[PDB]
Amino acid sequence: KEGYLVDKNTGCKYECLKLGDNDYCLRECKQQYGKGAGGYCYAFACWCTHLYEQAIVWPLPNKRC
């Protein structure tokens, strides 16, 4: 599945700067969900791909940014 990278402490999305293909998001997504994950910059937030069904993505409960 796919979803936004979520900071598990603040509950925020990761803002990114270069829309579309983005190494920063690829790197941040793999670091959170594993080396098999992908990710790119979408509406200026990291959107992670190839996630296992159970992976925790935005939004987290009661963790508002």
Partner: antibody, heavy 116, light 109 residues
Framework: VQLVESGGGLVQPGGSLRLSCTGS????????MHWLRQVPGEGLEWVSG????????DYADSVKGRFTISRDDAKKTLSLQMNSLRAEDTAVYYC??????????WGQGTMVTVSS | GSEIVLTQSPATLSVSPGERATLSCRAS??????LAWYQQKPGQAPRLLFS???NRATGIPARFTGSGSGTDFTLTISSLEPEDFAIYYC?????????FGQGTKVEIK
Amino acid sequence: VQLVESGGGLVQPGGSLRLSCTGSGFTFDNYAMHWLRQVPGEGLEWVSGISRSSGDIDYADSVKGRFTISRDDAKKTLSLQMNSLRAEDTAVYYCARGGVGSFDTWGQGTMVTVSS
Amino acid sequence: GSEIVLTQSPATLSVSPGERATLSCRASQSVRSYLAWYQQKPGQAPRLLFSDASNRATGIPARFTGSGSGTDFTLTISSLEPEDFAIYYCQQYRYSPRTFGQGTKVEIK
């Protein structure tokens, strides 16, 4: 939550100027930061921005190669190195906090004037 | 590359307090929901009004409402207070670079 910017002033075409922005009232580390600008009496234009940990950076086409953005998270500051200035760069320059697509907090603005 | 064009109408809106103000923002093509709104009083820096089509920024009164998705966005000020006379700018963020409308000046009638 407040932003404060400095280092604006007068300059000559081809000249250089370095702006600086200081954040207070929030965890500077956690936020993407941006420079935007506004020609007096005209509309807004995004200039440049930098992500958490300085891991992603970008610039508006009109400014790519001439400007260089950077941050220092210990000092809670954001910088803009302006080079090879032109008449177009004449504007109020705003520092702003990223709101994931939008800009939720703006400083007061510092004026940059390039003649002729 | 091309840039999303945002067309705000009317350029100038005459309204008296207590009346309802309706602002439009139209995009050259669909930006889905990634449409922010700003307010700017003279000599002042802009402030965030909406972060996307319908999400009010913190501190903004519920008299302001945004709606729309795709190409046609509306900002509605239900019962205009005098402090609401300002310039309103729309801004898209689906595509790069981000772009802004040319603004709608809300003046008193």
